[PDB]
């Protein structure tokens, strides 16, 4: 009943393996942050099998809209960027993780998007 959502960009031509790695990046950062600042909710999520919903979004604008809504609702979220073409600079935004939180709350933000 606690779930995490990760929303993945479909316009980047990412392979199956890269998508999994990017979703895992989002999930790791959200989980660790939530363990720090939202412990009881993290624990419940984790003990219920750390359930995750993975949706796909059309473009960067959708990622940023999710971000906007998550911050407004006080939901833990992490925009994920891959490695650069340049080691010094940050890379492309691939996905965004949310939660863990209440599924009903999370669906208010991501429910509209197609499952990956």
User: N-to-C terminal Cα separation, in Å?
Assistant: 20 Å
Strand composition percent: 25-35%
Proper CATH architecture = 3-Layer(aba) Sandwich
Strand order, main sheet: write it out. 2-1-4-3
Q: How many beta-strand segments?
A: 4
- Would you identify the CATH H-level superfamily? Bit1
Largest sheet: 4 strands, mixed
Can you tell me the number of structural domains?
1
Q: Kindly identify the CATH topology.
A: Bit1
Total of helices: 4
Helix content: 40-55%
Structural class by sheet pairing and helices:
alpha+beta
User: Could you state the order of secondary-structure elements as H and E?
Assistant: EHHEHEEH
Shape: globular
Polypeptide structure, described:
One of its GO terms (biological process) is translation. Keywords: Cytoplasm, Hydrolase. GO terms for molecular function: peptidyl-tRNA hydrolase activity. The longest helix is centred in the first third of the chain and has 22 residues, at 16-37. The chain has a single domain (1-116), classed as Bit1 (3-Layer(aba) Sandwich). By secondary structure, the chain is α+β, with helices and mostly antiparallel strands. Helix content is 46%, strand content 25%. The protein has helices at 16-37, 39-47, 60-73, 103-110; strands spanning 2-9, 52-57, 77-81, 93-102. The chain starts with a strand and ends in a 6-residue tail after the last helix.
